[PDB]
Amino acid sequence: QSTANRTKRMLNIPPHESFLNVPVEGDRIIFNPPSSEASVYHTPFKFLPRSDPRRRANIYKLFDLPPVLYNPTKSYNVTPEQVEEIRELRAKDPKKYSVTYLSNKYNCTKVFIMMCTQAPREHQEQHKLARARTAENWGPRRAAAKLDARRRKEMLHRGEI
Amino acid sequence: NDRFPPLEPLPPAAESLPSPLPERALTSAKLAALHARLNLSPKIPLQTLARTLVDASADENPQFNNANLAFVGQTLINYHIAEWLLCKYPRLPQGILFSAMKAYAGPKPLLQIARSWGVDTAAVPGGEVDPGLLQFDALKPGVAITNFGYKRTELAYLEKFKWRRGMASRVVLDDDFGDVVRSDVSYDRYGNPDTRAAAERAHAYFVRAVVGAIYAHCGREAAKAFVKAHIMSRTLDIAKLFEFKYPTRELAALCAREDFEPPVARLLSETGRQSRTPVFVVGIYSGSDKLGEGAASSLDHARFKAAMNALKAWYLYSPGENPRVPSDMLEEGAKPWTPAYIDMGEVISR
Amino acid sequence: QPPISQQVKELLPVLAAQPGHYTTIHIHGKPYLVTEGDTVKLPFKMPGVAPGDVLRLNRASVIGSRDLTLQGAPYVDERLFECRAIVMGTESEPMRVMIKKKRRCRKKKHVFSKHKYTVLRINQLKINDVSSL
Amino acid sequence: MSQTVGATRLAYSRVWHHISAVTPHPTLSTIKAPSEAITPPSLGRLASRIATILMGKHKPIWDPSTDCGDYVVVTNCAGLYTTGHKKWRKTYYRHNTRPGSLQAITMDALMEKHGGAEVLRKAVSGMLPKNRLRDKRLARLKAFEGDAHPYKENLVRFGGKVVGAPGWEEAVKAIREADMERL
Amino acid sequence: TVKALTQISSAGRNGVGAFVLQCKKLDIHYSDWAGSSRGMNGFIKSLLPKFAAANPQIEFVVSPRPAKHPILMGHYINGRTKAICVRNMEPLEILKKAELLRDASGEKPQKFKKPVTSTNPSVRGVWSPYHGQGMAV
Amino acid sequence: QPRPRWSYTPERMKGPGFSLNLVKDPRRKQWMVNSDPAKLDAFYDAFLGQGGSRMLSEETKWLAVTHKSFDYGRRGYNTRLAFLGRQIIALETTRSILTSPVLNEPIVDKYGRTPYNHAALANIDKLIYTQPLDIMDKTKIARMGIDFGLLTVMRWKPRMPEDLESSGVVVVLNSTLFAIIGAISLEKGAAVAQRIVREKILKRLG
């Protein structure tokens, strides 16, 4: 527009209808749950101590569940004796007795196999090299996208995403 | 010469002295203005406020300098900020507690506080400079304030071979912020990363010495009021000091410790799946209670963000915005003390 | 004085118990939605105030939290809240020149405007305990 | 300024809305009684509702300079509802600056070449601001002739229930009730 | 596991808890010869003494500057300066100009855009389409 | 009737039931801790005088005494209470020197200057000759706990039971003694905490 005053009126957005039903003859307290994401300082009642008196029924009361995305199940299929078999095999031939082979053999997760034993230092260096050789095959466009994916992850755990 | 007589009379031995004499503080317009800019009590004379501006690097004598005044003030600042965080956020992890303290009473904020007061520094210390200027020599790092930490016998290996250092021991060995202990002249040069640390250190000792001066002249309550007015008045978002590693495991360990039902991630809302910028809104429930929620552009990220927000809500629990502090009982005529909430400790997980 | 309603005396503690609070103060009738610690730049030079003066604001149309909102018909009762501000100083804008001109007339008349603005700092915004009233 | 300090990620995100051109609409229809006479939204009345979504004017953070619009997936555009004799008497024109090259076509003949989706795109296109955001906003309109479309997974959901589904309002209310159990 | 970030520090809010006048020094230059300083010399004898007695937090430095107009140069905590030439001004015009430097901050002049300036987050949060009652087209 | 958190370990935080890491000497896997409330109260009364057992809560008595090395921290530890307890003892030790009615020979200035010579600054000049770290020594504070029987009731897992010094018994003893003071402050206040640091720590350290 020609002036800032006119520009302010053309871009005007009215207030929320909750604030429009103003009271008369006295003050009033209304329940106005906003359509927004709450801060982490609104501690859920489950995280309040048993002593904290602020625990109280919902404000709505003072006036099924959604779909499952991740519900894992822990399993313990390996015994103290099988753990030793995983150690001798991994050190005997780390190429044949990979973690995937030992995972499927003892019905475990690939991580647990790595918590019980680690391949010799020689077998580990060639793993880091194999991943470094495939990285030099990336062009400037793919190497930049890979680095962005590694930064977004770090930023996420810093609260920046 | 005859046409340019000296503006401020000074004996010939003035330049020889490391710092201006005490009586000179009674003729400086910078001091008198600084004394009134801070609304200090008239019980604090100008000769004392002048002594708070002389760093040990400018005057090596135990007197005439900041050494002792700054040590007393550091103990008051650190104490009042420590008890205040444990009563406002009693569940903060120890690492986050060290950063919160360093964020309020560390060299970085105190530098900003000293500059908020309009305190300019002298180029090079000497008995000819204005007593109202902060005097220090950034070329001499051989000055260190006394603290309550000890030197680790493995400090040499801590820095070279990357040996491990735990958190539980930083409370006894390291300093008040978790840092290890003990970590002619030509001015034709430029700054250095060491001169900046020496300058930032000098400003910090000044702010501390001012608190120690108020304590020596006014008393304990006056010192607490000063700390509560210029330091605790600052704003800090502690939620931004959190950096999680495997937050999904820490939340599972939390629910297991408190005997809550295992956490289950549930998709509360979603839109744009099979697009370039989707939005997955995931919420983690322990039974029927919603603990945390996070919205990201990936299913895994949204699940991690939801667990992080669930852990922040646990750690950032606050009984109140202006809670009572155990220091309030020293002030006679105070109501009986009610026991505060003491947390067990941060969750340790795989 | 007019007694507070029982509906307000029952929920005000629930309003003051939540973490954050905002208020809509009215200076000379114009609203300003502020919070504790906010800086207000008024579009006028308040006469008779110097940097360091403390003001007590007593005309609030809305005092609310995330979920609850206290509304006064003309305004909220002064006994329910305490809002205080401090005069931080006076700011100015850069001189702007308005050239008044018509077509086919050479006279270009200039208008020089440089207005001053008083700046406040909201240093207190609390809700009082009404269990006594 | 407090009301704008925070996370604006979800306010600027692109939501995928859905509407069927055949489902009766008590709000956009002119007939409101009896219940069996409520019609779907007419061509232009539907287009005026869509242009608002594409502009983002339904958002409290709307600004015309920012492209804060959403997607709109329209299905069953073959049964586009029209009144009177528009289908056979309305004409769309076209010229390419060459005298004699005026192209004309009726609505029914245009729906035979490009389907009812093109009839709805032209109606929404003329209702959008004539600026450099008109082609982007119009591209986010996803019009299809039948019930099948490649965005059945993008439509906004609340508890697994797509908006407009039978029981999507109960899934929403159930989530808000569980959201008040906190300070 | 929670790792602490040590790059964030607290910010000061001048006015909350304690107030600090931004003007820390006032340079008052005059001339015993220039005719444009006839009023400045009267301000230094008649009004500056009482004005300085009322502002003990400001440092006043009166120094001659012959061959030059009279100026009022204020120094501010932010590190900037503001000099006002008061040539051919009467003493009470100098005082009104000196109160301008006291009440002012070193910040550069800015056009009026928004009354309120806040750094704390929204009490009601920011709007989101995934946290309401939904919207049916 | 709930259970005290210090007595048990959460059931769902346990593992398969066997150790997954190798050990060089199985003799170092054996270490007994206290589990008798009577033996714990006997230490508090002996350390805080008669009436000290009731000073702290039941759950706080075991928390201020448990170290982070006990049961992988599944049950709470005293790392936060120790952080506050050091700030308190650091302050009371400083106040002990300032108000100490002792005056020594002043320092002579190489340049012949004369100090301000204010009385308020004389109390602070006492720090020139006596530093708090000279009184709050690890070995001294660590020795107090051993005398009052703190080594018999403290809960922790030594790196090597055959050598407690190399395992960190000193650092662990200091952390536990600070926590007992940091807990009294939060539960009883600075008045009670201050009265105890002066009579039960400073008065015994000299």
GROMACS .gro file of N, CA and C in nm, chain E residues 12-101:
model
  270
  839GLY      N    1   2.149  -1.038   2.980
  839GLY     CA    2   2.104  -0.940   3.076
  839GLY      C    3   1.983  -0.862   3.026
  840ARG      N    4   1.896  -0.828   3.120
  840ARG     CA    5   1.775  -0.749   3.092
  840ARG      C    6   1.783  -0.623   3.178
  841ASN      N    7   1.848  -0.520   3.126
  841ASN     CA    8   1.859  -0.395   3.200
  841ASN      C    9   1.721  -0.342   3.234
  842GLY      N   10   1.695  -0.328   3.365
  842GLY     CA   11   1.565  -0.286   3.416
  842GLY      C   12   1.501  -0.389   3.506
  843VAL      N   13   1.526  -0.517   3.480
  843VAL     CA   14   1.475  -0.626   3.563
  843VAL      C   15   1.577  -0.651   3.674
  844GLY      N   16   1.533  -0.639   3.798
  844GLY     CA   17   1.623  -0.655   3.912
  844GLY      C   18   1.702  -0.530   3.945
  845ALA      N   19   1.770  -0.473   3.846
  845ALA     CA   20   1.847  -0.351   3.867
  845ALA      C   21   1.845  -0.268   3.739
  846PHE      N   22   1.854  -0.137   3.755
  846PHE     CA   23   1.859  -0.044   3.643
  846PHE      C   24   1.996   0.023   3.637
  847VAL      N   25   2.039   0.054   3.515
  847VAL     CA   26   2.168   0.118   3.490
  847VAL      C   27   2.148   0.220   3.379
  848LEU      N   28   2.173   0.348   3.410
  848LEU     CA   29   2.162   0.452   3.309
  848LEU      C   30   2.265   0.429   3.199
  849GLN      N   31   2.222   0.439   3.074
  849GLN     CA   32   2.310   0.406   2.963
  849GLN      C   33   2.416   0.514   2.942
  850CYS      N   34   2.380   0.640   2.963
  850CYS     CA   35   2.477   0.749   2.950
  850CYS      C   36   2.574   0.745   3.068
  851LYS      N   37   2.702   0.723   3.039
  851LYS     CA   38   2.804   0.713   3.142
  851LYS      C   39   2.899   0.832   3.145
  852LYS      N   40   2.898   0.917   3.043
  852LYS     CA   41   2.989   1.030   3.037
  852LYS      C   42   2.929   1.137   2.947
  853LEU      N   43   2.955   1.263   2.982
  853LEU     CA   44   2.910   1.377   2.904
  853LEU      C   45   3.027   1.473   2.885
  854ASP      N   46   3.071   1.489   2.761
  854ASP     CA   47   3.179   1.580   2.727
  854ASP      C   48   3.119   1.715   2.688
  855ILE      N   49   3.155   1.820   2.761
  855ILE     CA   50   3.099   1.953   2.743
  855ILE      C   51   3.214   2.045   2.702
  856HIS      N   52   3.217   2.081   2.574
  856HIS     CA   53   3.323   2.163   2.518
  856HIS      C   54   3.271   2.302   2.489
  857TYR      N   55   3.351   2.403   2.522
  857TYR     CA   56   3.314   2.543   2.507
  857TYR      C   57   3.428   2.619   2.441
  858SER      N   58   3.408   2.750   2.426
  858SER     CA   59   3.508   2.838   2.367
  858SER      C   60   3.493   2.976   2.427
  859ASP      N   61   3.604   3.031   2.479
  859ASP     CA   62   3.602   3.165   2.534
  859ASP      C   63   3.609   3.274   2.427
  860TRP      N   64   3.626   3.236   2.301
  860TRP     CA   65   3.641   3.332   2.192
  860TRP      C   66   3.527   3.325   2.091
  861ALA      N   67   3.482   3.205   2.055
  861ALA     CA   68   3.377   3.192   1.954
  861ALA      C   69   3.247   3.253   2.005
  862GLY      N   70   3.183   3.333   1.920
  862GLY     CA   71   3.056   3.393   1.956
  862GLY      C   72   2.941   3.295   1.958
  863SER      N   73   2.955   3.181   1.890
  863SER     CA   74   2.852   3.078   1.893
  863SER      C   75   2.845   3.006   2.026
  864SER      N   76   2.939   3.031   2.117
  864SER     CA   77   2.944   2.965   2.246
  864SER      C   78   2.901   3.057   2.360
  865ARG      N   79   2.845   3.174   2.329
  865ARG     CA   80   2.798   3.264   2.434
  865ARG      C   81   2.693   3.196   2.521
  866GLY      N   82   2.608   3.114   2.461
  866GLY     CA   83   2.505   3.043   2.535
  866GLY      C   84   2.559   2.924   2.610
  867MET      N   85   2.653   2.852   2.548
  867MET     CA   86   2.714   2.737   2.616
  867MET      C   87   2.784   2.780   2.744
  868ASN      N   88   2.854   2.894   2.741
  868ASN     CA   89   2.922   2.941   2.860
  868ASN      C   90   2.823   2.972   2.972
  869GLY      N   91   2.706   3.025   2.936
  869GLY     CA   92   2.603   3.048   3.036
  869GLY      C   93   2.543   2.920   3.090
  870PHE      N   94   2.532   2.817   3.005
  870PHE     CA   95   2.483   2.688   3.052
  870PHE      C   96   2.579   2.624   3.151
  871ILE      N   97   2.709   2.646   3.135
  871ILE     CA   98   2.807   2.586   3.224
  871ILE      C   99   2.806   2.654   3.360
  872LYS      N  100   2.766   2.781   3.366
  872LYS     CA  101   2.766   2.855   3.492
  872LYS      C  102   2.632   2.852   3.564
  873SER      N  103   2.521   2.842   3.490
  873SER     CA  104   2.388   2.859   3.548
  873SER      C  105   2.313   2.728   3.568
  874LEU      N  106   2.323   2.636   3.472
  874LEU     CA  107   2.240   2.516   3.472
  874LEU      C  108   2.318   2.386   3.481
  875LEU      N  109   2.442   2.383   3.434
  875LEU     CA  110   2.521   2.260   3.438
  875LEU      C  111   2.550   2.218   3.582
  876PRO      N  112   2.580   2.311   3.673
  876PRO     CA  113   2.609   2.268   3.812
  876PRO      C  114   2.496   2.190   3.875
  877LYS      N  115   2.372   2.238   3.861
  877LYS     CA  116   2.259   2.168   3.921
  877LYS      C  117   2.224   2.042   3.844
  878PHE      N  118   2.237   2.045   3.711
  878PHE     CA  119   2.210   1.927   3.631
  878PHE      C  120   2.308   1.814   3.663
  879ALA      N  121   2.435   1.848   3.685
  879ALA     CA  122   2.533   1.747   3.720
  879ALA      C  123   2.512   1.695   3.861
  880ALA      N  124   2.466   1.780   3.953
  880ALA     CA  125   2.440   1.735   4.089
  880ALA      C  126   2.324   1.636   4.095
  881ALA      N  127   2.232   1.643   3.999
  881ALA     CA  128   2.117   1.554   3.996
  881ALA      C  129   2.145   1.423   3.924
  882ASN      N  130   2.254   1.414   3.848
  882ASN     CA  131   2.292   1.294   3.774
  882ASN      C  132   2.430   1.249   3.820
  883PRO      N  133   2.441   1.193   3.940
  883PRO     CA  134   2.572   1.149   3.990
  883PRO      C  135   2.628   1.026   3.920
  884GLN      N  136   2.547   0.955   3.842
  884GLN     CA  137   2.594   0.838   3.769
  884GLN      C  138   2.659   0.873   3.636
  885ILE      N  139   2.658   0.999   3.596
  885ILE     CA  140   2.720   1.044   3.472
  885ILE      C  141   2.849   1.117   3.507
  886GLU      N  142   2.949   1.101   3.421
  886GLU     CA  143   3.078   1.168   3.437
  886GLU      C  144   3.081   1.290   3.345
  887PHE      N  145   3.092   1.409   3.404
  887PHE     CA  146   3.093   1.534   3.330
  887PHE      C  147   3.236   1.586   3.321
  888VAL      N  148   3.280   1.617   3.199
  888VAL     CA  149   3.415   1.666   3.174
  888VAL      C  150   3.401   1.796   3.095
  889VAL      N  151   3.431   1.908   3.159
  889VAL     CA  152   3.427   2.039   3.095
  889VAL      C  153   3.568   2.075   3.052
  890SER      N  154   3.588   2.093   2.922
  890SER     CA  155   3.718   2.124   2.866
  890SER      C  156   3.701   2.226   2.754
  891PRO      N  157   3.789   2.325   2.743
  891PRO     CA  158   3.777   2.422   2.635
  891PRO      C  159   3.817   2.363   2.501
  892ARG      N  160   3.755   2.415   2.396
  892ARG     CA  161   3.784   2.373   2.258
  892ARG      C  162   3.778   2.496   2.169
  893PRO      N  163   3.877   2.585   2.181
  893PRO     CA  164   3.874   2.709   2.102
  893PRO      C  165   3.877   2.679   1.953
  894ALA      N  166   3.834   2.778   1.875
  894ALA     CA  167   3.827   2.771   1.729
  894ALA      C  168   3.723   2.671   1.680
  895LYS      N  169   3.636   2.622   1.769
  895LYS     CA  170   3.538   2.521   1.733
  895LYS      C  171   3.405   2.554   1.798
  896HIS      N  172   3.297   2.511   1.734
  896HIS     CA  173   3.164   2.528   1.791
  896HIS      C  174   3.154   2.449   1.922
  897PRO      N  175   3.055   2.481   2.005
  897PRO     CA  176   3.034   2.401   2.126
  897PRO      C  177   2.953   2.276   2.095
  898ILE      N  178   2.990   2.166   2.160
  898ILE     CA  179   2.924   2.038   2.138
  898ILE      C  180   2.899   1.970   2.272
  899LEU      N  181   2.797   1.885   2.275
  899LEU     CA  182   2.769   1.796   2.387
  899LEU      C  183   2.785   1.653   2.337
  900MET      N  184   2.894   1.588   2.378
  900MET     CA  185   2.925   1.452   2.335
  900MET      C  186   2.899   1.357   2.451
  901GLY      N  187   2.797   1.272   2.436
  901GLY     CA  188   2.766   1.171   2.536
  901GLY      C  189   2.826   1.037   2.498
  902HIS      N  190   2.875   0.966   2.599
  902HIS     CA  191   2.929   0.832   2.582
  902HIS      C  192   2.839   0.732   2.653
  903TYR      N  193   2.813   0.619   2.588
  903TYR     CA  194   2.713   0.524   2.634
  903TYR      C  195   2.776   0.389   2.661
  904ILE      N  196   2.706   0.309   2.743
  904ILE     CA  197   2.759   0.181   2.787
  904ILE      C  198   2.780   0.087   2.669
  905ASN      N  199   2.703   0.104   2.561
  905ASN     CA  200   2.719   0.018   2.445
  905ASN      C  201   2.846   0.047   2.367
  906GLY      N  202   2.914   0.158   2.396
  906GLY     CA  203   3.038   0.192   2.330
  906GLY      C  204   3.028   0.292   2.218
  907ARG      N  205   2.912   0.354   2.199
  907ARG     CA  206   2.891   0.454   2.095
  907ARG      C  207   2.884   0.593   2.157
  908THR      N  208   2.888   0.694   2.070
  908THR     CA  209   2.885   0.833   2.112
  908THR      C  210   2.777   0.908   2.035
  909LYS      N  211   2.734   1.019   2.093
  909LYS     CA  212   2.636   1.108   2.030
  909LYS      C  213   2.677   1.251   2.061
  910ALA      N  214   2.717   1.325   1.958
  910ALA     CA  215   2.760   1.464   1.973
  910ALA      C  216   2.655   1.556   1.914
  911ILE      N  217   2.620   1.660   1.988
  911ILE     CA  218   2.520   1.758   1.946
  911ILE      C  219   2.586   1.895   1.948
  912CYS      N  220   2.595   1.958   1.831
  912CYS     CA  221   2.646   2.094   1.822
  912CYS      C  222   2.538   2.190   1.869
  913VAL      N  223   2.571   2.271   1.970
  913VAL     CA  224   2.473   2.360   2.032
  913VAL      C  225   2.510   2.505   2.002
  914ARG      N  226   2.570   2.529   1.886
  914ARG     CA  227   2.605   2.665   1.847
  914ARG      C  228   2.481   2.753   1.843
  915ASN      N  229   2.496   2.876   1.892
  915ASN     CA  230   2.391   2.978   1.885
  915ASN      C  231   2.265   2.935   1.959
  916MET      N  232   2.280   2.852   2.062
  916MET     CA  233   2.169   2.808   2.145
  916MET      C  234   2.175   2.877   2.280
  917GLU      N  235   2.057   2.903   2.338
  917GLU     CA  236   2.051   2.965   2.469
  917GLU      C  237   2.065   2.860   2.578
  918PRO      N  238   2.106   2.901   2.699
  918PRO     CA  239   2.133   2.803   2.805
  918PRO      C  240   2.022   2.700   2.824
  919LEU      N  241   1.896   2.742   2.826
  919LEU     CA  242   1.787   2.647   2.844
  919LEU      C  243   1.770   2.555   2.725
  920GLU      N  244   1.813   2.597   2.606
  920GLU     CA  245   1.818   2.505   2.492
  920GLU      C  246   1.929   2.402   2.509
  921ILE      N  247   2.039   2.440   2.574
  921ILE     CA  248   2.145   2.343   2.602
  921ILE      C  249   2.095   2.237   2.699
  922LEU      N  250   2.026   2.281   2.805
  922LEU     CA  251   1.976   2.187   2.905
  922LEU      C  252   1.880   2.087   2.842
  923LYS      N  253   1.786   2.136   2.761
  923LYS     CA  254   1.695   2.045   2.692
  923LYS      C  255   1.772   1.948   2.603
  924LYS      N  256   1.884   1.991   2.546
  924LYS     CA  257   1.967   1.902   2.466
  924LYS      C  258   2.047   1.805   2.552
  925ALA      N  259   2.087   1.847   2.672
  925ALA     CA  260   2.161   1.758   2.760
  925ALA      C  261   2.071   1.649   2.817
  926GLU      N  262   1.946   1.684   2.848
  926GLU     CA  263   1.851   1.582   2.893
  926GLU      C  264   1.822   1.481   2.783
  927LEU      N  265   1.836   1.522   2.656
  927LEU     CA  266   1.819   1.427   2.546
  927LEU      C  267   1.927   1.321   2.548
  928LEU      N  268   2.052   1.361   2.573
  928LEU     CA  269   2.162   1.265   2.576
  928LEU      C  270   2.151   1.172   2.696
   0.00000   0.00000   0.00000
